[model samples]
Target chain A: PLEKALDVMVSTFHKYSGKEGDKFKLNKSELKELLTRELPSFLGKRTDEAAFQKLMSNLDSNRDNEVDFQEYCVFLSCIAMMCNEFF
Target chain B: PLEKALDVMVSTFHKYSGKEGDKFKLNKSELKELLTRELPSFLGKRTDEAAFQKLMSNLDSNRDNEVDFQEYCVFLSCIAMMCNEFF
Candidate 1:
């Protein structure tokens, strides 16, 4: 069961990132959709274009305008750390 | 469903780390048990004393001989990256 969390993390990314170009990478819109829909509790409701671009730039480590699995994992880890501190 | 992965990640650490000292951190034994049980597929059966000690040293960023939640999350992220590459 503990391992499933990691599995779901990997699967959830592919569930969205595979919708467009670079099946293994999440483009700007896909990343926004993921945060807005899947992580709404953490991200709040500011899913505007400008905000999305800002997040994209922040997460696109390779400057490829995409959120790869590694970047996504780091983002999730940061969010989890925030959650740990929140409660 | 996707968000649940993050929730699980947060909860799972507490489940194990709370078993002993500090309550919020995993000491050597706790870390070894977590790896041997929760991540057997990744860690395999090489959970000997030396290997566990080596891993603890590598993960104990603060050199405190304990793995905090942040360190644990980073370790999981690294494992997830390895899994991503494996398949």
Candidate 2:
């Protein structure tokens, strides 16, 4: 469902963001775990995953460029674009 | 299920973006169409949808802040965040 896209994105972030640091944002650890567990498939492509690790900087656009809702949105958005281009 | 989020997002955007101008991005009409048809639920809430229309400016981050993949990402991300806040 189209809504599910929003569901998973918000659901996963809220779930994980509540784990470690800022309740409203994702810290490095939270970001890592969330991507590791929730987005295994996206991160599964070892090369892409490596790229993801490198690109992690881009995700957290808050805490000195953190991964708050806005950053997460952009992050997921880019990945979706990536999925569109190749998948 | 999680992956569907990505699939739906990328699938829907690519599908609609291909319909009109800028093949790579969404023009005003294309943006309207994609949001109207593909995001009926998000746009269904008359009040929120009204808010959405008003906020349309933010989505079009190119063509003088147009709606390309990135802007679309941010738009959907915000909606997802809103969903998190309420639903």
Candidate 3:
């Protein structure tokens, strides 16, 4: 429950007021900042460069170094709902 | 680590090959479908109405019953990364 609660917190933060096209427009640096700072207490753990780069590759379709909204939303919902179920 | 592993699975799924406008265009049903169908094995647990409502509300910013991609991605990253950290 606590883990789900935290997922809710982080999931809600990105989605508070975002629009359609804004989701995947962010760059790697923005993602890095968001992950390191905005997320709850634990996520900012040692930033694994390999992990970060790996994550970015998944998000950056077309190899464009940006993520669009469709990709981002589905990703969040999947994680949030899964976090609730798994943990 | 297991929770984070699950998150990566879901996050990667959404961002696999999508564009910007595609992210936020999904409806509630679509989100539910994705959550129920695509998420990894552990997430298909018994559902919680209140929790689901709270989560959808967070995504449906305009109250239009739709979640744009930006709202979606940020939400997922927040959840996935935090899930990695806290759980």
Q: For candidate 2, what is the DockQ-based docking class?
A: medium
Q: What is the DockQ of each candidate?
A: 0.76, 0.58, 0.06
Candidate 1, residue A13: lDDT = 86
Chain A TM-score of candidate 3 vs. true chain A: 0.57
| Chain B alone vs. reference chain B, TM-score for every model | 0.90, 0.77, 0.54
Name every residue pair that clashes in candidate 1.
Answer: none
- lDDT, residue A36, model 1: 83
Better candidate by lDDT, 2 or 3 = 2
Model 2 C-alpha lDDT per residue in residues B4-74, reported as the tens digit of each score: 68877877877777886577787666777787777788666553554655656657655453477767877
Model 1, A5-36: lDDT tens per residue?
78878778888898998989999878877888
Better of 1 and 3 by DockQ: 1
Which of 1 and 2 is the better model by DockQ?
Answer: 1
Report the number of the highest-TM-score candidate. Answer: 1
Please name the candidate that would achieve the greatest DockQ relative to the true structure.
1
Candidate 1 residue-wise lDDT at A86: 83
Per-residue lDDT over A8-59 for candidate 3, one digit per residue giving the tens place of the 0 to 100 score: 4445435431433455255666666655555444364557886678766876
> How do the candidates rank by DockQ, highest first?
1, 2, 3
